Amino acid sequence: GNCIISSIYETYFGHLNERERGDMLVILKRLLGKFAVKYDVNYRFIDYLVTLDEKMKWLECGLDKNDYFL
């Protein structure tokens, strides 16, 4: 389920603002509940793809602390 969410997040949600991304996550979780595929309420793509060393390397390079830019 998290891999499905991660694929959709990577290839679909890269060009949406915060409110539309929230609505899209709401609709996608509604679809997952309708078709009964297990996913986490508290899943984070950062914890599954971004490492601490990579996060520090990007933070020192000038990246902001927002989840959006992360």
Gap between the Cα atoms of 30 and 25, Å rounded: 8
Is 39 buried (19+), middle (13-18) or exposed (0-12) by CB count in 10 A? Answer: middle
Q: How many CA atoms lie within 13 A of 46 on its CB side?
A: 12
Q: What is the resolution of this structure in A?
A: 3.3
Task: Please give the single-letter amino acid code of residue 21.
Answer: R
Task: Pick left, alpha or beta for residue 27 (phi over 0 → left; psi -120 to 50 → alpha; otherwise beta).
Answer: alpha
Q: Rounded to the nearest 5 degrees, what angle is found at the Cα of 22, between the Cα atoms of 63 and 55?
A: 25
- Experiment type: cryo-EM
| Two structure tokens written together for 27 | 């609709």
| Two structure tokens written together for 45 | 């793509």
Phi, psi of 56 (to 5 degrees): -65, -40
